[PDB]
Amino acid sequence: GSRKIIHVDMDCFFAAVEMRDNPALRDIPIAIGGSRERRGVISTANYPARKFGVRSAMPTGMALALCPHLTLLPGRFDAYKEASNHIREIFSRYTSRIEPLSLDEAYLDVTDSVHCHGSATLIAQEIRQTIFNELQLTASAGVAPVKFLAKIASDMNKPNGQFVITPAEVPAFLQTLPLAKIPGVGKVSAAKLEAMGLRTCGDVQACDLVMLLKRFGKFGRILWERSQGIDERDVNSERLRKSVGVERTMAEDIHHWSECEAIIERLYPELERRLAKVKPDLLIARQGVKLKFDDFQQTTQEHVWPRLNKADLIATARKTWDERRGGRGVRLVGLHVTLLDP
DNA sequence: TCTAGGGTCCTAGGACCC
DNA sequence: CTAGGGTCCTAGGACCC
Ligand SMILES: Cc1cn([C@H]2C[C@H](O)[C@@H](COP(=O)(O)NP(=O)(O)OP(=O)(O)O)O2)c(=O)[nH]c1=O
Ligand SMILES: [Mg+2]
Ligand SMILES: [Mg+2]
């Protein structure tokens, strides 16, 4: 049938929390991320900072050259987790059909809801208002028949706005809809499509499905389908973690193995008490290490393993260091597990 | 500018299992 | 009358947050 899906997205999440807890900011360029000292990257920035072009995933050195007066914050994660849990409770007030995508995002299947006369608009509006009141955080929302259009509409009226796409508005909306606006379509994909003369969903509607399946596989099918406005993806609410890892980037050096091992020794206690939280007996289908080199190239080494143990990680990391390092310096060391199925 | 720390899913080359 | 099909490892890419 036709569903009423709602995507909720917190506006400038981290920076919003930090500004909420410190009004001395608010009107100044702030950003959450690591220092150029410790080779950091911007997690997110507030709007005054974005005015200078400060983006997420931007190297802090690049952001400081764009915004010399950028105030750099480290990040208060628990303060984000409380907000996330809170807004999720707020979501649960309206339905059980809830698929959290992160801390500040969630899909809601709100069709069978009898809350605001079956209106997803008033429901989303009330969720945003409730969030505003109970958290002093602002939020934006997308309302759509399917998921990806709810996600797209979620960004069309931010900050503190919501956008609604009706089944009757879908075809007109799809025609001049750039493929890069579709979730799952990043720079590489969009450049591939662009090179193939495809920019919009309307461009894809007049395309051969067989060709798309050839050049992209599943991605081609999904591209064609959502270009048609088809997204049979159902809001899950039973979704679970499929991995946990602990990795770190240094100022650098480490060209010696003892340094890598020391860093592993300092990384393992945390891989423990993060895994212990969601399986006290330390489950594990696979275990592994990751190394990132000075050329920014990285390698991972995992293996079938029955239970978390430091020694094996150290051995594997020794083999990765011995065989794949190639005399290169290492900027990052990482540990990783994979968990089991139910 | 000099590029985090988390995760998701997808593919694929080769190794097994039958 | 040497096994191809399918599943599993496992390393890596693209992507999102
Ligand atoms: C994209 C991104 C986000 N984050 C964190 C910071 C954000 O506060 C949080 C939510 O990400 P988002 O919704 O994609 N970004 P935002 O909410 O801060 O920006 P917007 O207001 O939604 O436009 O995730 C990163 O730590 N690295 C990233 O690359
Ligand atoms: Mg978002
Ligand atoms: Mg957000």
Give A88 Cα–ligand 3 centroid separation in angstroms.
14
Measured CA to CA, the distance from residue A272 to residue A264 in angstroms comes to: 12
Whether residues A167 and A209 fall in one domain: no
Q: What's the longest Cα–Cα distance across chain A?
A: 66
- Residue type at A88 in one-letter notation: R
A159: preceding bond cis by omega (within 30 degrees): yes
Positive or negative torsion for Cα A41, A277, A12, A102: positive
CA dihedral of A85, A89, A95, A97, whole degrees rounded to 10: 20
Whether residues A96 and A17 fall in one domain: yes
Task: Examine residue A33 and state whether it is found in any structural domain, yes or no.
Answer: yes
Whether residues A274 and A202 fall in one domain: no
Q: Tell me which residues have their CB within 5 A of the ion that is ligand 3.
A: A 9-10, 13, 104
Whether residues A285 and A323 fall in one domain: yes
Q: Give the orientation angle of helix A77-92 with respect to helix A120-135, to 10 degrees.
A: 140
CATH number of the domain where residue A68 is located: 3.40.1170.60
| Alpha-helix runs per DSSP H in chain A | 13-20, 47-50, 60-64, 77-92, 120-135, 147-154, 170-175, 187-195, 201-205, 209-216, 218-227, 257-275, 310-324
Resolution (A): 2.7
CB A298 within 8 Å of CB A255:
no
Give A160 Cα–ligand 2 centroid separation in angstroms.
13
Whether residues A12 and A147 fall in one domain: yes
Q: How far is CA A7 from the centre of its chain?
A: 14
**A61 CA: nearest nucleotide by C1':** B1
Task: Examine residue A7 and state whether it is found in any structural domain, yes or no.
Answer: yes
Which method was used? X-ray
Task: Examine residue A190 and state whether it is found in any structural domain, yes or no.
Answer: yes
What burial class does residue A299 get, using C-beta atoms within 10 Å of its C-beta: 0-12 exposed, 13-18 middle, 19+ buried?
Answer: middle
Whether residues A5 and A145 fall in one domain: yes
CB A179 within 8 Å of CB A222:
no
**How many Cβ atoms sit within 10 Å of the Cβ of residue A188?**
8
Task: Examine residue A35 and state whether it is found in any structural domain, yes or no.
Answer: yes
CATH number of the domain where residue A196 is located: 1.10.150.20
Domain span at A291: 242-342
Whether residues A95 and A220 fall in one domain: no
Query: Which of A175, A198, A222 is a domain's end point?
Result: A175
Whether residues A2 and A112 fall in one domain: yes
Which residue pairs, CB below 8 angstroms and at least 24 apart, start in A43-47? Answer: A43/A14, A43/A75, A44/A12, A44/A13, A44/A14, A44/A15, A45/A12, A45/A15, A45/A70, A46/A12, A46/A15, A46/A16, A46/A19, A47/A12, A47/A159
CATH number of the domain where residue A303 is located: 3.30.1490.100
Q: Report how many domains make up chain A.
A: 4
Whether residues A4 and A112 fall in one domain: yes
What burial class does residue A19 get, using C-beta atoms within 10 Å of its C-beta: 0-12 exposed, 13-18 middle, 19+ buried?
Answer: buried
Whether residues A145 and A198 fall in one domain: no
**How many Cβ atoms sit within 10 Å of the Cβ of residue A137?**
21
Return the structure tokens found at A164. 């609604």
A105 as an active site residue: the answer is yes
Pocket of ligand 1 (CB under 6 A): A 9-14, 43-44, 56-57, 104, 158-159
Task: Examine residue A237 and state whether it is found in any structural domain, yes or no.
Answer: no
Q: Which ligand is nearest to the CA of A150?
A: 2
Whether residues A127 and A2 fall in one domain: yes
**How many Cβ atoms sit within 10 Å of the Cβ of residue A92?**
12
- Residue type at A103 in one-letter notation: L
Task: Flag whether A104 is marked binding.
Answer: yes
Measured CA to CA, the distance from residue A271 to residue A310 in angstroms comes to: 10
Task: Examine residue A248 and state whether it is found in any structural domain, yes or no.
Answer: yes
